[PDB]
Structure 1
Amino acid sequence: LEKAREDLAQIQAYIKNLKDVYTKQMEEKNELEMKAAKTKKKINTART
């Protein structure tokens, strides 16, 4: 019981660190998504 409690606590802490890294990641990836939008239609219209 004690060992499993400690293991679960460590796993939860690592999960929180990964979740914060994930937080910055999808914020930055959404910024890159909106940048990468609006130029595909631009290339299509340009080549039309």
Structure 2
Amino acid sequence: LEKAREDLAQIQAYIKNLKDVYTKQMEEKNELEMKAAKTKKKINTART
């Protein structure tokens, strides 16, 4: 029972870490998309 609770507590830590890395990866993705949109507007405005 003791060993199970430790491993349960372990995974909860890993579980939360991987969610936090996921959220960071999504925020990075959004920032790059916003930069990618601005660069395209600069792209189009220059061609015109």
Q: State whether TM-score is above 0.5.
A: yes
Q: CA deviation at 1:42?
A: 9.3
Q: CA deviation at 1:18?
A: 1.4
Q: Whose helix fraction is larger, Structure 1's or Structure 2's?
A: 2
What SS is found at the alignment partner of 2:8? helix
Q: CA deviation at 1:4?
A: 0.9
Q: Following the alignment from structure 1 to structure 2, what is the Cα–Cα distance between the partners of residues 44 and 34?
A: 15
Q: CA deviation at 1:36?
A: 3.5
Task: Give the stretch that moved more between structures: 6-15 or 29-38.
Answer: 29-38
Q: What is the percent sequence identity of the aligned residues?
A: 100
Say what the alpha-carbon RMSD is for the aligned residues: 2.6
Unaligned runs of 5+ in 2: none
TM-score (norm 1): 0.59
TM-score (norm 2): 0.59
Cα displacement string for residues 5-30 of structure 1 (whole angstroms, at most 9, x for unaligned residues): 11010001011111111111101111
